[PDB]
Design a protein around this ligand. Structure first.
Ligand code: HEM
Ligand code: HEM
Ligand SMILES: Fc1ccc(-c2c[nH]cn2)cc1
Ligand SMILES: Fc1ccc(-c2c[nH]cn2)cc1
Lengths: 367, 367
C-alpha cells in the first residue's frame, strides 16, 4: 500500500475513529507493542476460557483462538517456552542446504516465457520447509495452501466469530491423524497435557500460520527489487541480507496488529479507556521519518533498519529467523538463475492485514 | 497497477507469451483497436449463431455473449445504432441536476471521522443514475451491486464461462420482469427484431455493464488527487475536466482488452497467425513516452491527453460522456463539501482487467 499515513503520523498519530483507536507513528506503535501489561493480546477468550478448556467443558471450538499469539504472560510465556528453540541458529544452519535445494527444485519448474512466481516459488517454499522441520508430511499440496490462506485470514480477525468450515475441519483431522510423525517440538506439545484444543491450536500455529506471510515476503521482495531495478546491485554488492530487511520495512507482510487496553492508559496526548481496541499500523510506523531517514526511499543497504515487521517485545515473531533465511535463499537462487526479469501482471491479496500478491506473472531470461 | 510494462513497451511491444499475443505500446494498441476487420471482437460466436438466434433455434444461452461489445460490422453497427443517441449532450444536460442532487445526498451519508467512500459514493452513484435513465427501478440495492460485479467479471473473460449461476439467473428474472416498464431506449430494444436472448444481453449491457467501471473511475480519481495532493489546485484552477481525463489515463478502470485475428497479420516486426488471441494493454499504452511526454507523471491539466481508456475506433465506449459527467459531478461536489482528506485504508479489486478499489477508507473535515 502507498504510504497514506504521513500527515496522520505527523498530526494525528493516535486517532480515535469512532469505533477503535488507530496508531500510526513509530514511537507509539513500538510503545504499545512493548507494554503488554496495559495493551493486552487476550483478544480471543483464551484466558477467560482456560478453565473450561482444561477441565474439558469445551470440546468443540476454534483451535486458533487458543495459541500463544492471543495470550498474555504468564500463560504466553509458559506456551512460548515450549518452542523457543525451534528455529535455533544451529538448526537453521544445517537446514540451509535443504532450503536452497528446495528453492532450486522449484525454480526448475518455471517457464521463462511466462510464469506465476507466486504459484511456482513463493507459495510452495515455506510449506515444504516447515513440513520438513515439524516432520508433518505434505500429502495434498492443494489442501496445505488452502489451510495456509484460511488460517492467515482468521488470525487477521481476532475475536470475530466464524464457525468451523469444511476446510478447517479437514485441517484439524489432518493434525489429529499425524501427531506422532512429528519432530521434537510436536512431541513436546502432544506430551504436555495441554487441552486437546490447545494442542491443535499450537501445532496449527507452527505448521500453518507462517506460510502466507513468508510467501508474501518473497513476492514483495521480487516486486520491490524489480520496481527499483536493484537486482544487479544486490548481486554485485552482496546486499541480500540488508535488501530483505528493506523489503520487510517497505512492504510488510503484516500491515498492522491489534491490542485491547486492560486499564485506562495515556498514549501520546490521548487518553484511552479500559477495554478499548488499539490498532497499531506497522506499515506506517515503518515509514516514520523520525526513525528512518528518507523513509519513503527504498534503500537496499539501509542500516540501521529497526522496522517493526516482526513486531516488538514479548510476541516478537518466533518465525523471524526462519522467514528471513527462506526469503534470502529464495532471492539468492532466483537472482542467480535468471536475468532480465520483466513483470507481465500482478494481482494483490484482497486483505487489509495481509500485504502480498495473489498473482505475480513474469517473463525471465536464463543464465 | 505500477507501470511494470515500461520494459516490454520499449524492447518487446508485441510479445508472444507461449499462449497468446500481448501488446504494450500505444502505436500498436491503437492500431489493433482500430483495425476491426483484421482484429475481431467476435469472441463469443455471436456472428456464427446470428442466423439461429434470429430464427428461434437458440432459446437458451448466456445473454452477455450476444451484445455489441463482442460483434463486428455489420452486426455491431446495426446494434449500436439502436442506442447511439442514449447519452446525447442534450439528454445529459437535463440529467445534471438529478446527478448533482443524488451526489449530495450520498455525500450526506459520509461520517467524516471515518468512512468508506467506495461504499458511500462510488458504488451507489452509477447504479442510481443508470436506473433513472433507463426507467428500471432499484428494488434491491444489494442485488444490483452483486449483478454489477458479476457482469463486470464475466465481460472481462470473453468467451469463457458457459454456466449461468443463481445470481445471474435472478438478474435475468429481473429484466424479464421489467421489459415493458423502461424508458424509450429500453422499449426500442424490447420491440426490435432481435432474439429474446439478444434483448436480454442488450439490456444487461446498458443497465449493468457500466456500473463497476464508473465506480472505479470515481475511486481512482479520489485516490490519485489525494496521492498527488491536487485537491486545492483542482478547485482553484477549475481543473475537474482535465484532471478526470488524467485519472483515466493514469488509472484506467479497464486495464486491457482482447481481439482475435481473422487472418495472418503483421503487427510491428511480428507476424501473427489467423485465429490468435491478441491482448491489448490500455494501461501500458497510456504511459507510452512517445505519446505522453513525462508519461509517468500525473499532470492534472495534461493536454493533449489521447488516452485509450474508453478504447478507440468503432467500439469506443458508448457510455463515455455519461461516465465523464458522473465522475465530474462526484468530484466537484466532494471537493466542495469536504477538506483535508486523509486516507486511512485501501483495498484493491482482485482482478487483472478491472482496476479499482473494494475499499477506500478516509477521514474528512466538513465544508
Ligand atoms: C515474513 C514472514 C513473517 C512475518 C512478517 C511475521 C510477522 C509476525 C508478527 C508481526 C508477529 C507479532 C504479532 C503481534 O505482536 O500481535 C508474529 C508473531 C508470531 N509469528 Fe510470525 N511472521 C512471519 C513468519 C512466521 C513464520 C514462518 C512462523 C513459524 C513457522 C511464524 C510464527 C510466529 C509465531 C508462533 C508468533 C507468536 C509469537 C508470540 O506470540 O510470542 N511467523 N509474526
Ligand atoms: C469510466 C467508465 C468506463 C470505462 C473506463 C469504459 C471503458 C470501455 C472500453 C475500453 C470499451 C471498449 C472495449 C473494446 O473495445 O473491446 C467500452 C465499451 C462500451 N461501454 Fe464503456 N466504459 C465505461 C463506462 C461505461 C458506462 C457508464 C456505460 C453505459 C451505461 C458503458 C457502456 C459501454 C458499451 C455499450 C460499450 C460497447 C460499445 C461498442 O461495442 O460499440 N461504458 N467501454
Ligand atoms: F493476520 C495475521 C497476523 C499474523 C500472522 C502471522 C504472524 N507470524 C506468522 N503468521 C498471520 C496472519
Ligand atoms: F472486463 C470488462 C471490460 C469492459 C467493461 C465495460 C466497458 N464499458 C462498460 N463496461 C466491463 C468489464
Amino acid at each position: 500500500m502507498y504510504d497514506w499515513f504521513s500527515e496522520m503520523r505527523k498530526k494525528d498519530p493516535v486517532y480515535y475513529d469512532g469505533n477503535i483507536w488507530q496508531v500510526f507513528s513509530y514511537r507509539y506503535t513500538k510503545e504499545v507493542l512493548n507494554n503488554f501489561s496495559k495493551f493486552s493480546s487476550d483478544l480471543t477468550g483464551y484466558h477467560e476460557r482456560l478453565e473450561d478448556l482444561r477441565n474439558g467443558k469445551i470440546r468443540f471450538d476454534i483451535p486458533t483462538r487458543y495459541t500463544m499469539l492471543t495470550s498474555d504472560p504468564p500463560l504466553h510465556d509458559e506456551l512460548r517456552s515450549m518452542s523457543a528453540d525451534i528455529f535455533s541458529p544451529q538448526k537453521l544452519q544445517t537446514l540451509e542446504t535443504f532450503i536452497r535445494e528446495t528453492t532450486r527444485s522449484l525454480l526448475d519448474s518455471i517457464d521463462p516465457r511466462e510464469d506465476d512466481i507466486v504459484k511456482k516459488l513463493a507459495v510452495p517454499l515455506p510449506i515444504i520447509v516447515i513440513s520438513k522441520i515439524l516432520g508433518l508430511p505434505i500429502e495434498d499440496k492443494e489442501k496445505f495452501k488452502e489451510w495456509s490462506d484460511l488460517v492467515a485470514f482468521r488470525l487477521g480477525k481476532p475475536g470475530e466469530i466464524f464457525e468451523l468450515g469444511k476446510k478447517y475441519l479437514e485441517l484439524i483431522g489432518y493434525v489429529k491423524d499425524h501427531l506422532n510423525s512429528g519432530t521434537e517440538v510436536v512431541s513436546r506439545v502432544v506430551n504436555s497435557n495441554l487441552s486437546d484444543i490447545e494442542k491443535l491450536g499450537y501445532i496449527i500455529l507452527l505448521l500453518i500460520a507462517g506460510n502466507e506471510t513468508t510467501t508474501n515476503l518473497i513476492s514483495n521482495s521480487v516486486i520491490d527489487f524489480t520496481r527499483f531495478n536493484l537486482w544487479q546491485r544486490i548481486r554485485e554488492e552482496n546486499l541480500y541480507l540488508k535488501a530483505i530487511e528493506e523489503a520487510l520495512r517497505y512492504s510488510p507482510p503484516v500491515m498492522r496488529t491489534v491490542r485491547k487496553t486492560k486499564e485506562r492508559v495515556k498514549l501520546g496526548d490521548q487518553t484511552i479507556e479500559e477495554g478499548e481496541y488499539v490498532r497499531v499500523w506497522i506499515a506506517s510506523a515503518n515509514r516514520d521519518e523520525e526513525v528512518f531517514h528518507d523513509g519513503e526511499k527504498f534503500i537496499p543497504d539501509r542500516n540501521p533498519n529497526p522496522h517493526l515487521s516482526f513486531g516488538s517485545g514479548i510476541h516478537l515473531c518466533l518465525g523471524a529467523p526462519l522467514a528471513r533465511l527462506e526469503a534470502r535463499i529464495a532471492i539468492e537462487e532466483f537472482s542467480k538463475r535468471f536475468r532480465h526479469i520483466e513483470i507481465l501482471d500482478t494481482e494483490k491479496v484482497p486483505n487489509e492485514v495481509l500485504n502480498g500478491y495473489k498473482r505475480l506473472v513474469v517473463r525471465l531470461k536464463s543464465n
